[PDB]
Each structure stands twice: as C-alpha cells, then as structure tokens.
Design a protein around this ligand. Sequence first.
Ligand code: HEM
Ligand SMILES: *[C@@H]1O[C@H](CO)[C@@H](O[C@@H]2O[C@H](CO)[C@@H](O[C@H]3O[C@H](CO)[C@@H](O)[C@H](O)[C@@H]3O)[C@H](O)[C@H]2NC(C)=O)[C@H](O)[C@H]1NC(C)=O
Ligand SMILES: *[C@@H]1O[C@H](CO)[C@@H](O[C@@H]2O[C@H](CO)[C@@H](O[C@H]3O[C@H](CO)[C@@H](O)[C@H](O)[C@@H]3O)[C@H](O)[C@H]2NC(C)=O)[C@H](O)[C@H]1NC(C)=O
Ligand SMILES: *[C@@H]1O[C@H](CO)[C@@H](O[C@@H]2O[C@H](CO)[C@@H](O)[C@H](O)[C@H]2NC(C)=O)[C@H](O)[C@H]1NC(C)=O
Ligand SMILES: *[C@@H]1O[C@H](CO)[C@@H](O[C@@H]2O[C@H](CO)[C@@H](O)[C@H](O)[C@H]2NC(C)=O)[C@H](O)[C@H]1NC(C)=O
Ligand SMILES: O=C(NO)c1ccccc1O
Ligand SMILES: [Ca+2]
Length: 595
Amino acid sequence: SWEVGCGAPVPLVKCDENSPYRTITGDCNNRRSPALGAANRALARWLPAEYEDGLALPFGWTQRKTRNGFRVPLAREVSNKIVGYLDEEGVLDQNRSLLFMQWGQIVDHDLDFAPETELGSNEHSKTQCEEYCIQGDNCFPIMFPKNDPKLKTQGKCMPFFRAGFVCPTPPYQSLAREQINAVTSFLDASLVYGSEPSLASRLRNLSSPLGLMAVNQEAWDHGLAYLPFNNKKPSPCEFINTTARVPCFLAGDFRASEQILLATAHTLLLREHNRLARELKKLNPHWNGEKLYQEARKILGAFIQIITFRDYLPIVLGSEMQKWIPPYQGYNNSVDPRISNVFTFAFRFGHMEVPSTVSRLDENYQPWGPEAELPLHTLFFNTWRIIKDGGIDPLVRGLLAKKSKLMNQDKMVTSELRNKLFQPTHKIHGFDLAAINLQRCRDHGMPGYNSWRGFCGLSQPKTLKGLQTVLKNKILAKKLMDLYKTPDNIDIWIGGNAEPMVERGRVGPLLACLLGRQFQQIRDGDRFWWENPGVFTEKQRDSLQKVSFSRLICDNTHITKVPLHAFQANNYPHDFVDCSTVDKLDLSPWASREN
Ligand code: HEM
Ligand SMILES: *[C@@H]1O[C@H](CO)[C@@H](O[C@@H]2O[C@H](CO)[C@@H](O[C@H]3O[C@H](CO)[C@@H](O)[C@H](O)[C@@H]3O)[C@H](O)[C@H]2NC(C)=O)[C@H](O)[C@H]1NC(C)=O
Ligand SMILES: *[C@@H]1O[C@H](CO)[C@@H](O[C@@H]2O[C@H](CO)[C@@H](O[C@H]3O[C@H](CO)[C@@H](O)[C@H](O)[C@@H]3O)[C@H](O)[C@H]2NC(C)=O)[C@H](O)[C@H]1NC(C)=O
Ligand SMILES: *[C@@H]1O[C@H](CO)[C@@H](O[C@@H]2O[C@H](CO)[C@@H](O)[C@H](O)[C@H]2NC(C)=O)[C@H](O)[C@H]1NC(C)=O
Ligand SMILES: *[C@@H]1O[C@H](CO)[C@@H](O[C@@H]2O[C@H](CO)[C@@H](O)[C@H](O)[C@H]2NC(C)=O)[C@H](O)[C@H]1NC(C)=O
Ligand SMILES: O=C(NO)c1ccccc1O
Ligand SMILES: [Ca+2]
C-alpha cells in the first residue's frame, strides 16, 4: 500500500457519469480515479520532497544544519545581490505586449493556489511573527541581511507564513509534508466560476432565470458591468485609500484584486459570460437558467484553453514547444492531470516580466490625463482607480499598446515588486516578491537546481566554470557560487530563471521542460479538453477556433480599434484595425431544435 489513504481537506460528493458539464471542484473528470485533478488536494510530487528533517522543516530553518555541507543563503540576500537593479531604461520586451505578462498570471491562477496557513484571528501569532520576528511553527521570517536599508527603515524581518497543507492544519507528524492546491488543476476557468460550490453559487445571479453571474449594483462602466464587491471587512482595497473606501472585487479566485490589471482581465471574462449567456438565451428561448450558465461556462473554458495553447504557449516555449507538447492525439485516461509542486515555482518566471509602470490611454491611445503613467506599487489591491478613474477601457488599451518587461540576467525583478510589494494581511508597501519566492521554495521542500536539470535530462554543473557555460554569464555564475557554494543548493526559482532564453521563447531549457511537461499533461488528461471528440460538435469546434483576445475586447468594451495579434508588440495606429474587421464567434451551431 503506497501512501494512498489521507484525504480530508476535502469536500466529498457523488459523480453523475453522463453529465456533459464539468463539476465545479474538478471531481469526476477522470472516471477510474474521480479525485484526480480536483481542488483542495495535494500538489503532485514529480520528485521526493527535500526537507531539513526529511519530513517538514524547510532548509534554512535550523541555523546550524546545512544543505550538502553548506549554509543556505538568506532569501533576501540573494534578492539584493542578484535579482535587483536600478535602471528601468532598456528593459522592455520589444516583441511582447503587456497582455503577454497578464495572460500568464491568469493561466497561473486557473491552475494553482497554495494558500498560507491561517489558524488564529485574535491571536498574538500574527503579532509574534511580524512584531518580533520569532521563528516558530508556521512563522518562518525572512531575515534582513546586515547592510540592508530595510533594517534602518522597516524592522528586523519580513513576516512570512508557511503554506497550508493536506491532511490538517495542526501538528501533523510522519509522512512528508504536502502543500495544498486550492483550485482545480484543469484549465477550466475556475478563476471565474470558483472551485467550491459554496463560492460558485454566490457568484451567480440566481434571482433571475438567465444564467448570469452577479454584477456590481453600486457602480457601472458606461453601461457595462463590474465584478461585485466583496462582503468581508477589513478589505485591503479600502485600506490603501480610506477616503475613497472602495472594497476589493468578488471573483472565482481570491487573488483577483492583487493588481489593477488582473482585476481588469477578470472583468472582461465576467462580461463575456453574461454576453454569451444572454446571446444564448436569444437562440434557445426554452433553455433554463442552469443550462444557460453551464453552456456559457463551457464555452468560456474552451476560449481560455484555445488562447493559451494556440497563442500563448508557442511564444513562451518557442522552438521547444514541439518537443514537449506534440499535436493532440485525444484523451488519455492514464495521464496524471494534477499540477505539480515545482510547476507553481516554474510558472513564476512571470515575475521577471512585470514592468515598473501601468498606463491609461485615451481613445486615440495617447496619455489619459496628467497622471496617466503610474508606479506599479500604487496599484496593488487598488480597485478605486477603476471605479473612480475612468473604468477599464483606459487600462485595456495600455494592455494592448504597452510592452512587457523582458527577462534580463542583469535586471531580473523590478523594485516595485522587489522592495514595495503590498501583502493583503499587512499594512506596508514594503515586501519583496523575489525573497518570498525563494523562501517559499524552501517552504515547499523543493529539490535543488541540479536535481531538476537531471530530471529534464540536462547537464548538471558542479563547478563555477560548469555553471558559467550553462548560464553563459561569467559574473552571474560567480555571484551564484559565492552565495550558494555549490550549484546543487541553488533554489529552483532563481536557477531556472537565470538560464538564457531558448530560441523564439521567453524561458530557458530547464523551465521549458518543466512548463511543457505540465501543460502536455493537463491537456492530455482532461476529459473535457475542447478537442476531445464528443465534448463539442464538429461545427461547434469550427466556430470556437476563430476566437481571439482581440474580439473579446471588441465585444466587451467600448474600444473600437484593436491589433490582430494581441500578444506581440503592436504600434498604434499602424498595427490597429477596426473591430468590425475582426472575426466574431458564431454561436449558431449552439442552436437546438427539440421537435
Ligand atoms: C503583484 C503580482 C503580479 C503582477 C504585478 C504577479 C504576476 C504574475 C505573473 C505574470 C505570473 C505568471 C506569468 C505569476 C505567477 C505566479 N505567481 Fe505572481 N504576481 C504577483 C504577486 C504574487 C504573489 C504575492 C504571490 C504569492 C507568493 C507566495 O509564495 O507567497 C504570487 C505567486 C504566484 C504563483 C504561485 C501561485 C500558487 O500556486 O500559490 C504563480 C504560479 N504572485 N505571477
Ligand atoms: C514577434 O513575434 C511574432 C509572433 O511570435 C513573430 O511572428 C510569428 O513568426 C512565426 C515564425 O515561426 C510564424 O509562425 C507561424 O508560421 C506559420 C504562419 O505563416 C504557421 O503555419 C505556423 O504554425 C506558425 O504559427 C508567424 O508568421 C508569426 N506567428 C504568429 C502566431 O503570428 C514575429 O516574427 C516577431 N517579430 C519580430 C520583429 O521578431
Ligand atoms: C484616494 O481616492 C480619492 C478619491 O478617489 C482621490 O482623490 C481624488 O483625486 C483627485 C485629487 O487628487 C481629484 O480628481 C480630479 O478631478 C477632476 C478630473 O475630472 C480634476 O479637474 C480635479 O481638479 C481633481 O484633481 C478628485 O477630486 C479627488 N476626489 C476626492 C473625493 O477627493 C485621492 O487622490 C486618493 N488618495 C490617495 C492617497 O490615493
Ligand atoms: C440579476 O439579473 C437581473 C435581471 O437581469 C438584474 O436586474 C436587471 O438589470 C438592471 C439592473 O438591476 C435593470 O435593467 C433592471 O432593473 C433589471 N431587469 C430585470 C428584468 O430585473 C440584476 O441586477 C441582477 N442581480 C445581480 C445581483 O447581479
Ligand atoms: C497515455 O499516457 C501514458 C502515460 O503517460 C503513456 O504511457 C507511455 O507508455 C509507455 C509504455 O508503453 C510508458 O512506459 C510511458 O509512461 C509512456 N511512454 C513514454 C515514452 O514515456 C501512453 O503511451 C499513453 N497511451 C496512449 C494510448 O497514448
Ligand atoms: O497575487 C498572487 N499571485 O499571482 C497571490 C498569490 C498568493 C497570495 C496572494 C496573492 O495576492
Ligand atoms: Ca482550474
């Protein structure tokens, strides 16, 4: 008996085996093993976890224990000496729009979420961790180096809490610690609809038989919907501006308001569901609410799948695309569709793609107002700039017309994220996402850089010189050695991202392998994959492959000019055409006759 037993975070129910619709939780996708890919289950392990005590303590916890003979460097040190930089000039990606970064975050949020541990509201725990920086239980602080300016200004550490895990929440004790994925592993738009029946239902408009999602009642965007506000106070969104007092939005995913451009994409998707559902009510007047909801939902999930696999993946993986994701051959019930623990770190290549500012453009795509270009850090958990400063059209135009940041070995992550991150649970704009990613690697018990190179069949450098040749960078390799003392101890997030980009792509070999395997598996092991015979009809398929992010914008905003290939860098006005030139989604194939 393999470690097959434990199952408890978990909400349990029965499977209607002939339902043409996915469950909200992901259960029932695989017929022989119904829990596969479901939400609130453990992240899969492609390799055994590596903890300090073999079971649960992260490396770096016990200051005297080493990793292969050496102390592991402080997360914030590595951040300071390797990841930071000062000059934002020359840093933009010349052939990827801001939308390229933004889509990655959306896909990521549909596939994985490992929430921090809670246990204790009205507990000195949240206090003992932030106020005193005392390591202990789920408090695993990021200590500041000596010479770090945050020491003079912020305190002795940045609080950090370990990720939730399967089985409990209490002192669990024997088999290795496994973190939770709170969302469904299938690319199914769970970030729009929710992963729990509890939330899925609350998101819906059930007082009307139209199969629509609830929309904001306090505010409108020139007649277009906004996501509803969240009930819960205190909300970090009203905190960043107690005068405006505008709460975070309520969406299928809890991270929706982390930054204004993410909330903007969530709004576009909410609108498409309603557009689709009312458009479907027109062709099938007899269909009921539930049918409208499920059928629009199914359509929206196919859209996310199509854009991801047809438009997005090919420009991340480049020439490695064909190597890891061969053409679709059909559903394979033997494939594990679960998202792996390491994927959630590999997919973090996106953090190095975020630029320092966000712009709002007017109708001619020229600056909108006098304070049109804003620093990223003022937009974390900011919903007021949307409700009170022009709606989403100005931000959407920036998404289309501005560029992503390009990964650069000398310029990894912007200070907006590296020194000024705002955490929903705390009150300063002073966190470091890079140090957090590093610390989280250790928290999730990740094998080191060389373990993953071997897994992907790549050479494994043992020397500084071996490491120079792989990174193709003498000094980066050297700072890496000085901090880590052996390439075996290099945290995967930084190791993976330090490698040069493959041809036509935006990640290196190690990441291409880790990303590509994962995507191949969630496609091949998804019974509801859009191309799987029987999910949609042939005619429905011919209609779905004409979707494009450009059309989505046209139908759901007041923007009338869009580029044809939204993910590449596009210059206004030459690369911008009229919305009426853009292929629409033909829903006639969804018309039924029941006589
Ligand atoms: C602010 C943040 C972003 C933009 C300004 C941002 C952006 C991205 C991109 C573009 C990603 C992929 C293409 C991506 C992936 C994942 N992130 Fe990240 N992200 C912002 C902020 C955060 C924060 C805060 C976290 C949590 C860090 C922690 O470990 O505590 C974060 C994480 C992740 C993540 C893991 C999700 C999970 O499985 O739990 C990605 C796959 N991002 N982000
Ligand atoms: C900026 O990036 C653009 C998109 O990545 C790129 O254009 C793309 O170039 C590739 C070259 O491989 C072509 O790829 C397509 O080739 C044919 C289409 O003629 C198809 O049969 C293939 O399946 C594949 O999709 C495309 O012509 C184009 N890709 C897309 C999706 O439009 C530009 O070259 C880049 N610009 C610069 C200046 O480098
Ligand atoms: C917190 O949110 C506040 C309200 O949203 C915001 O104040 C608002 O923004 C500015 C003040 O700086 C004013 O906007 C402008 O309005 C017209 C443009 O249509 C101009 O002609 C005006 O001169 C003015 O500059 C709003 O009047 C103002 N609203 C209120 C109620 O004060 C704050 O700036 C936000 N504070 C922080 C710290 O973010
Ligand atoms: C649920 O749907 C109903 C019906 O579509 C929404 O109410 C309508 O929409 C707007 C704003 O309320 C107005 O044109 C009418 O007052 C309503 N028409 C009808 C037929 O009721 C309602 O806003 C939705 N509720 C939520 C919470 O989203
Ligand atoms: C369905 O997926 C399974 C699991 O990934 C595939 O298994 C392959 O089959 C060989 C033996 O025939 C196994 O050793 C490997 O796990 C897989 N091959 C390789 C090269 O790794 C299987 O091929 C798939 N089945 C179908 C019908 O496509
Ligand atoms: O935004 C996030 N990820 O992309 C995020 C992830 C974990 C915790 C909170 C957050 O805001
Ligand atoms: Ca999902």
